[PDB]
Every structure is written in C-alpha cells, then in structure tokens.
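Troubleshooting log. The previous run stalled partway through. Resubmitting the same eleven chains, unchanged.
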Amino acid sequence: ARHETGGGVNFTLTQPRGNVDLGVGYTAVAATATVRNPVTDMGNLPQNFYLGRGAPPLLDNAAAVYLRNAVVAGNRLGPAQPLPVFGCAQVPRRAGMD
Amino acid sequence: FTAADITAKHRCLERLIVETGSAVSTATAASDVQFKRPPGCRELVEDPC
Amino acid sequence: CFEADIAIPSGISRPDAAALQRCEGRVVFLPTIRRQLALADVAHESFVSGGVSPDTLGLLLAYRRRFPAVITRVLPTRIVACPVDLGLTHAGTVNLRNTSPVDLCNGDPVSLVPPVFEGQATDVRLESLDLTLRFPVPLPTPLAREIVARLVARGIRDLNPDPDLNVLYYNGARLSLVADVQQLASVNTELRSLVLNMVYSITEGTTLILTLIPRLLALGYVNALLQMQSVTREAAQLIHPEAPMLMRRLPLYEALVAWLAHAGQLGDILALAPAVRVCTFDGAAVVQSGDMAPVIRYP
Amino acid sequence: CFEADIAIPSGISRPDAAALQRCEGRVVFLPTIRRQLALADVAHESFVSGGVSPDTLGLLLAYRRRFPAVITRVLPTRIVACPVDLGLTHAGTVNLRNTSPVDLCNGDPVSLVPPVFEGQATDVRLESLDLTLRFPVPLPTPLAREIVARLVARG
Amino acid sequence: WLVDLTTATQPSVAVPRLTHADTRGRPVDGVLVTTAAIKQRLLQSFLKVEDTEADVPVTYGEMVLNGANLVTALVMGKAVRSLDDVGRHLLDMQEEQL
Amino acid sequence: EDTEADVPVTYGEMVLNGANLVTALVMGKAVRSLDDVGRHLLDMQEEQLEANRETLDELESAPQTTRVRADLVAIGDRLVFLEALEKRIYAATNVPYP
Amino acid sequence: HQPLIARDGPHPVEQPVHNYMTKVIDRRALNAAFSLATEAIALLTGEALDGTGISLHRQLRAIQQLARNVQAVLGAFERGTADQMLHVLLEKAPPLAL
Amino acid sequence: DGTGISLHRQLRAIQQLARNVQAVLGAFERGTADQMLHVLLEKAPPLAL
Amino acid sequence: HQPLIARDGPHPVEQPVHNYMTKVIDRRALNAAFSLATEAIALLTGEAL
Amino acid sequence: TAPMAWAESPRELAGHAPLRRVTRATRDDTEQAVDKILRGARRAPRYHLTRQVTLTDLCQPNAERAGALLLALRHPTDLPHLARHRAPPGRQTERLAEAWGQLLEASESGCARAGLVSFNFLVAACTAAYDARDAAEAVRAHITTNYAGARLDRFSECLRAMVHTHVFPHEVMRFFGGLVSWVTQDELASVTAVCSGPQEATHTGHPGRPCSAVTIPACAFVDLDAELCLGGPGAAFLYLVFTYRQCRDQELCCVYVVKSQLPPRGLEAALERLFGRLRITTCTYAAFAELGVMPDDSPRCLHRTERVGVPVVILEGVVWRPGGWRACA
Amino acid sequence: VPTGSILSTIEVASHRRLFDFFARVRSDENSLYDVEFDALLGSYCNTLSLVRFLELGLSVACVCTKFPELAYMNEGRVQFEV
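Second attempt completed without errors. Output:
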C-alpha cells in the first residue's frame, strides 16, 4: 500500500501470516534459570494509610489532624499535597535516592 | 483477602500453568514506588504467590 | 477497517456459543488496539478497578479510556470487532444494533453505560467460561445527554426528599425511564457516586465564586465590568446563598485549583462525546429498535 | 493529508540543520491554513505581539489562536507538518514525540502547554537566520488542566 | 384441468444429455403417472397421441471425481533415504487419479 | 559440533490438492456433445497437475544444504541448538528480548 | 495413528485407533514501511513536464539508495519472523518448575 | 506469482464475473418489456369507457 | 442465477444475489434377502455328492 | 507523452512493482460492460452520500439546484412536549402547539415524513425578519413562485414561536448535505445529498443532468456574511449561524453563513463581537455549525442570476465537513 | 439447449470419511474435515436463460431505436402535422 503523507508518497509493506502447533504434547518448555536483578529495593519501608483514600476520621477535628500530621510528617511516604477527589494522592518530592 | 481474586482464579492443574504467566498484581516497573497499575498498563508477570 | 480479532476461550457450551452469535452488531470497548486480544480482556470482569465492579461513574470513566469497537462478525473461536477510533473519518460503515429509541438518519450515537436502563438486562452472561458482557446502549447525543442529566437530576431529589423527570418523550416516542420496582433502587445506587461528584462540584463551585467575587474587585476594569453585567444575577445570588449558608485568599486560591480540575474531569466524563454518526442510504432512514443500523466513524 | 510545507529560509548551519533533524515529531503553531509558508511565521519571533513577547499565559492565548501542527518529516528545504486541527485525517496515527517529564498511558487525550517546568527547557536557537523555536509540551489533559489552573490562580 | 395439472410446475434445472424422444424424435418433458382405472377412462375420452418411446437413455449417469487425497506411504522400503520421494509419490497419484 | 547440520536454503511451497468445487461453463461452441462440457472438465484438471509437477520439480531442483554456523551440543544423547539470539536479531531494536 | 503393543492372553485384543486432528492457523500481519520525498521521486522519474533532463546517471545513484531501503525492510521481516516465532513458542510453553 | 494457480485461478473468476453480470443484463431486456407495459397501460382507457 | 427486472426509480438498485444453490441428499437402504436351505449347501460346494 | 503518464495515472506503481521484485452488439457491450467494472475495480473516501425520502411541502429539490444546503428538521412530532419544559413559566407554551400545527395547517404521519428543510426556505421565512430587505425578499419571491407564501408565513410563525419558548431552530434543523439528485414523484421526493466530502466532484458535468452547472451558492448577498473583513490568504471556513431577537425585535430569526479562517474555538469570540444583539440582557442566540472547508480562499463569487434575479454568491469548491452544534451562550 | 445459455456443471459435495470404516476407531476433533468432491455428469445445470424482448411479440407495439447520446440530450420533440 502506498499513501502520500510526508514529503511525497509512502509505502507500507504488510505480510499476512499464520501458524499452528505441531506438538501433540508439549514441544517447548520454558524455564527460569537465573534472576537478572531484583527490580525492587527489597525492604525496610512501611505502609502509610494516610495516603490511600482516607477513612471515617477521628470525630474530633483537632484529634484527627494531630495524628495525621504526626505520622505523615516523619515518613518517606505521606503526601505533601492535600488529597483531591479527581486525581492522585501526590506523594512527596525530592532529588535522588539510594 | 478478597477471594474474589482468589475466587476469580482457576485451580486447574490443567490450566494452572498457563495463567501462571498471568500475574496476580497490578504495577509497572517505571514508577517510583510500585503503584497500582494505571489503566494504560497491561500485564504478564508470572505471579506465583 | 483494521479488524481486531478477539479470541474466544476454550470449549464453551452450545447455548453460550449461540449467545455470542446474537452479539454481532454490539459495541465492545477494547483496552488496547492490539490485533490479537483475549475475551477476558473485553469482558465486564475486566472493568474491575478498586476491587469492585464499577458503578455508572466508574464505567463512564472506562468508556472514555478504552476503545469502542463494533462487533462485525462473530466466529466460533474468534470475535472480529473493528475499532471506532481508527481510520479516516466518515468511512468504515459498520452496522450497529439499535437499542431503545429509533436512531434516525443522523445524530451521532453515544454509547452510554447500560445501567441507565434495565440494569441486568443486557448482561449476557456466559456460564461455560464464567464471564459476562455489558454492552453500552447506543443513544443519540442530544438524547443521551438529556437522559444522563435527567437521572442525576432525579438522583439528587432522592438524596434528600420529603413534576416527573421520568417520562422523557423522545421525538414521537415517550421513552419510559422508570422500570419501577427496585430497579430504581439499583439504578439510584449506581448513580449514587455520580450524583455526589455532581452535587459537590456545584456546591464547591458556587461557594468558591461567591467567596471570590466579594474577595476580589475590592483589590480596576475587573470591578466595573464584573458588577456591570452581573447586576441582580451574581450579586443577588451572593446575598441569597450567603443568607442560607456561611461565608481566605490563601485557601481560596488553593481550593480554586483543586475545584477547577475536578470540574473539568466531570465535563470530560459527562457530555458523552459521540463515537459515530448514522449516515444511511438505500435504507429505511430510521432504525427501529433492535435493527442493525449503518454508522460511520465521525459525528 | 493536506500537509503544510515550511521552507527553511536559507542561512541555516551545519549545526543548525542538525538541530532541525531531531525536531520531527514536535509541534508547531502556524498562523493560517496554508500550502506555502515561510519559516519565520512559525518561529517564536512571530508569537511576539506589539513590541512584547507574551508571557506563559500569553502563549496559551496565542496557542488558542492559530493551528497546532505536528512535524511529520523534515527535508532539506521544507518542513512537513500536517495541521491536526484540520488534516488529522490519516488512516493510521501521526507520531507525536513525547517531550515532557510525564508519560502518556493509553487513551490519554493530549493537550499542549507552553514549556513550563523548571527542568523543562525546550527553547531552540538557530543562529544562521535569526529565529528560534519553542516547542509546546504535550501532556495529558488531566495534568494540563491542573497546570493552567495553577498559572491562572498564581496570576 | 389437465393443462393445469400438465403445466402448473417449473421446468427443472438439468440437461440430461440424453433425452427421451418420441420416435419422430420430439423430446419428452413430463411423466404423468396414474392408476390404471383413471388412465383407462382418461385415454378413451380424452388423450390419444403416439405410442412408443423413440429413445430412452439405456445407461446410468457418470461422475468425475475432483481429487482430494492423503498420501500415506511406507518408508524404510527404499523410499526411506529420500523422503522427498514422498512428494513425487503423491504427485504420482494425481496422475493416476486423472 | 558447531557448524549447523546442513540447514535450509528453502521454504517448502504448497501443492494445491483437494480444492475441487468442480465448475465449468460453456455456451455450446463447436459443441455437439454435451460431453464437450464433461471433456472440458478434464481439460481444467490437467493444468494443475503440470502446475504441481512444475511446483514439485522446482523444489526438488531448488538448492539444498546450505551450511550455517551454530553450536550443536550434546545433552544426554541429543544434539541440540544452543541459541541465544539477542546480539543477533534483537540487537538494538529497542524491542525487548522475550 | 496410535501405537499398539501386541499381547499374549485371551484378554481384549485392542484394535487400531487413529486420530484425525485439526488446529487453527492464526492471523498475523508483520508490516513495515519506508518513505520517499516528492523531491526524491523526480530523480526516479527523470522527465520534466517540460520533458527535459536528468541523463542516465540519475538511476545508478538513485536505485542504490532505494536498494538500501528495500534491503532494510526485508530484514525487518526476517527479524519479525524470529519474533513471531519466539512469541508463539513461549505463548505456548509451560515452565519447568510446574 | 507467475504460477499455475494464480494466473489460471484468477481467470476462472473472470468468467464467473462475466457470467454474473451477463445475468443482470436480462434485467434491462426484461426491464425493457416491463417498461413497455407501464407506458402502454398508461395510455389505455378502459374498454368499457 | 435468478431473473431480475431493472426498475425505474432510485429505490435502491436491484441487489443481485448470485449463489450456488445447495441441497441435501438422502439415503435409503432397500434391502432384500433369499432362501438357501441347509440342503443345497452340502450340495453346491460338493460336500454331499 | 510526458504530460499523460502522470495524467493517465505508472511511475509510482513501478516503484511498488520493483519492491515486490526484489446479439453481436450486446456481446460487444458485455465485453465493454465488463471493462468498465474492471477498470473501476482495478482503480481503487472523498465522498459520502446520504439519501432520504420526504415530501415537497417544505423544502423542494426541483426549485433548488446543483449546489444547495439542505437542513434536516428533526422531531416534527416532538416539540410540543419540549416546549412545556426549558421555557420559563410565563411563556405561553401553547403557542407552538398551534404554530407547528399552524405551519402544518398551511402545509398527519403517513409514510413520507416531511424532513429536509432547504437553505432557501429559511432565507425567505426570515427574510423580513433579519434586518435587510429586497435582496432578502428577492429570495422570498423565488420561493413563492417555485416551491406558497402561506407555508412561508406558517413556518415563520413557527420560527417565532420556537425562538419564543426556548426550543430553538437549532436543536432542530441539523445540516444534511449538498443535494446531488432528487428523483421526485408527485408529492414525494427521494433526495440524494452528500453526507460529507467535496461537492464539485459528484454528478458533475456542466450540470449533473441537463439544466446547468454546480455550485454551493449562498443564495443571498444577504446571507454569505463574509468575515475576514481584514484577512490573510488561508483556507476559508464555512459555518451556519442562527441569530435571534428576544423582545428587542420579538424573537428575531437570522440565518446565514460565515466564511473566514478561524477554528471554531475562535469563532465564538468573533461572534461575541459583530453583534449588538447581545442585549437579550433569557440567555442565548447565535448558534453556529461549520458546513465545511473551502480549501481555497478565492472562489467567493459575486453574481445575481438563478431560478428571478437573485443575489447569488457562488462558492467555488467546498468540502462539507459538518460537525455539531455549539451554542452555550 | 439454445445457443448461449451458459450450460453449467452440477457438483456433488460429499463428505467421505473412509478409514473410518475399514479398521481403526478413527477419532477426530470435529471442526475437522476430509472433504471430497465429484462432479456429476449424467446431466448438466442451466445457469441462466436470456430473454431478448425483440424476440417477444410485444416488440411490435413500439419502434425501438438505440440513441446512445440520450444521456446527453435535453429535450426530444416529435412534432406532428395533420
């Protein structure tokens, strides 16, 4: 197929193709062998629920927001930004880590 | 916990190997923390646990 | 057309295979335009997000994020659906199926979530492979928007209650809204979360302008022009809401940001941008409910 | 595809022409729907209103007016960009080069923004002929609408 | 009533390639089977044209078989060595089918 | 061993077989035998035989046994191909190795 | 066909069992593209509307560049085949551990 | 491809299409007669009258 | 092929369907049998002569 | 030779090929009939035709010509139900009932609905309404003598009644096409017209069948408000605007076309200007739709002959690209 | 068969599973086929019959003439003086 888009004509080659299984049983096995690298950091870091979707709070307004800013302020997790109904909890920002 | 997910699985030793490729989690490798997989994200971890 | 071929799973019951045969002409939302897709990826069990099956709002989110593709040919061990978003506009006429009102010779059908009408009606369950399909209803844009607003309007009265919105004659037809029974309790429970985002975004919008206008124009052309055309409209609404309500530039401006976003996120969800148009020829010009209708890609 | 050609004016440089080679996939705002156009109508020198360069809320109003065009290919004497506001009718899907810290996902509507990030940069200079090119930052509409709200409220 | 009986139908789709003639050789397009009782009272009061069949196609048809076949050979018989002899062996059968 | 057992230089094309749907048409030109139709069937048959005859002989003539490098390796009375293709075909495509 | 081991007792003498089995060839596409520039064609065309120009040294340098493109997109299909392969082998393969 | 099947397989679909549309010619021959009636039956007054 | 008649008017033009009419064959048995007495078995073969 | 290899089209094809590389009279007709199909077939999306059957009460294809705007008239049956709601209570919503009935009275459901209002028929109905006259009334003389002043007056009473009760002429009357070929019988018409794509490329000819020409002639020197009073060469654009009077003139209906290079997000601004009709102060007037591009600035022509001497503006080349209605304010 | 008429061929599509019979409990998936065809020649199929009009007797009532330019006309007038 040839179409004129940029600077002139453009050709697009496309080759319909198909395939089957010649095995009755399994003709191919996959293994895992080794692990290339652990993607994840792997530990020493908590859950902080003041990020995810809140809860019914402490029914004293001064109680709830004291515990909140007490826990959130120490963590590597608790978001600087207030929680928005549309969008994300917006975890805090920095420059570089380990 | 849920079991809708665990329920939503199969227990087929016939099938148990082919959804193994399917992963029982929803994150991506380009985030900072492992997040919930965004909708754009599609997935094929092998997810044993 | 760019057909994308959805792969039917392993052996399905003969009554299920006949359920799919009747699904040709139905709209599917496919998460990615990959040529080879599974059936489980399309099935309604793939709309789960927060661990729950999505409400009408959670659906309308997804309908705006994945690609609807009309089903063209259903084959045993395939489903061939041609995405609506791909290719040139006004081309790839593919047949739809009309559900409810007529779909006259034009009007740009919107595919709105199913629960707005008989809820479970259209669930189309497949027991053999243990999945299900909820096909959106193809309604015209003027009527689709009238309805979706009509129901959240009825939703709020219900929020606190002590003229029927539910008649809604469309063109010649008077389309019944209410299925009575507890369907409303099922309809109203799914619009529950859409109603709130609507109630919130209003109450949060007014109070945010009613605080801002008197906390602005008191600090040029801003003042004069504002109060000029706002005579007995904005200011009157200010005294009246401040009458039955309570009254901070720093929280003001930071709340004006968070509202301004949440607002436009609802305008995106809402307004049900048309997926397709109907342009017929050598055709009836009105597609009777349940009849395949021609349709083309852009409004 | 009603592509609009844009004639590199001349001048140019061995180093400047290598800068335009990597500008394919970026976005241009042209102040018309044309077939023949000059390179200087696209440049940031054209964004200049009477005597003054618009600020970063002024550009949004300038990008409001005129037409976004995504560069498809760049030839020795012309730049080919098809005006999305009109000539978007391609069977398959013109390439947009993501220039942003952000990441698109799939299905994200893409609205553009003047460059607005601290590490953003994005201004391009071409010394042979006096002109420059600021390319807008593509961005999901959820994020691009959060930004505009920030700039509006800050102003 | 006869000409309606005689003509209410649609001619078939066929050309037998051997047609029943009437010995002057006009072709026979019909059959009209009856009971001898009716035939009698019908022949005397009504119909009496010509008795003998100039031609009847004394044979029975034929068929040409388009060919679909699966060569399954037996190797280790000298065919083995070159199993491309299987290829030229199937293509043989097509000539024998011809 | 490390040179590949004579490895293909060729694809292995397909001989039409079993596609019949026997179909013919004539008007009766130089035709006094409806058989001329039937004999025109046998016409249409002998064309594909010469085609497969050509198609087969073409391959049997087509070049055989190109010798490629690869590492044939013995695991327990098996010669296997140890193939890691990254630096070969997935070299710098930005496409991730599967 | 399925194997039989003979036996030595009056017990059931099994009779040959033969499995006809069908599989589903899939569809794939594997498309590639290259483009030319309305300024690049006029080297190939070699004729002005005016009908004057570009003597015959125009081709030799032009088809080189065009061979560079055709050869580049014929290696996209040979590398695409290796993907289409490697994908349908592991789409269809089960781990070892399991 | 320069083969026996494609060159010779596509021609047999030309006579197929020569057959097909030669059939819709009768539509004009049959339609010609058909037209004659309507224009003759339009002229015609009832004999009674 | 089946007959058409071209007709005046834009009504959509005669849509000519051209198919291969198929059919389903049937199967009968038509069985018959015959006598062969234990006598005329010893005979015939030659057992009893 | 060199001018036809490009005109009769091989060279692009060759590049493609290289890539792969590396009763006698009736008989004559059948052979030729076949050739045409093959060539048409070998050859080969810039055209779309919509077709519909309606009556000649409103509209009327014969009066009109080769290039004309046909607007759909959705929900005739509906409207009364709509009038009761969306209209402030002191609007005497019983006005429409009679007015649509009145429009209809001037001239049931049957099997041919009356859809398809022509552009023409609006120009005459609002001719005395919008503020210009006799260039506008010349169009009204066109319709009374070809298409009835009753229906024009009845339909004008409907437009007044519609603009009265907050059911507008838009949210009715969407764009239908360019009128390729009508094929009418008696009170019936089968109208083919272009859903979208370019006009000049359709039945073509001098005229597509024997009358004359083709054009998308605005039909008014009264319509064809040509913006870009101050303009630069660019593809011109075509919109459809309804201007209204809300007691300033007693529910005025203005219907015309604007031709300037602005992408709809810029038309709302220029529509805010150029109107002193904004002093409605309920809210709303001036809806607009883009008929489609005219990807060449220059064909707007100055002429006055059609059907009577009418001001007719000829628009050379158009790519109908219809779009939706936007009026929020 | 009048001249023309496109005499056609009647093909018999017949599913033959042999070796089903014979020996072997042949077992297949279904959605499988070993189909075989044979064309039936005791007789042939008449695909289409053409009507000529003129060959009819209604052809008398008119003077049919072929005016190919009729696509290009405007008005045909036949005038009669009596």
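Takeaways: The first helix of chain C runs from residue 14 to 21. The CA atoms of residues 61 and 101 of chain C lie 24 Å apart.
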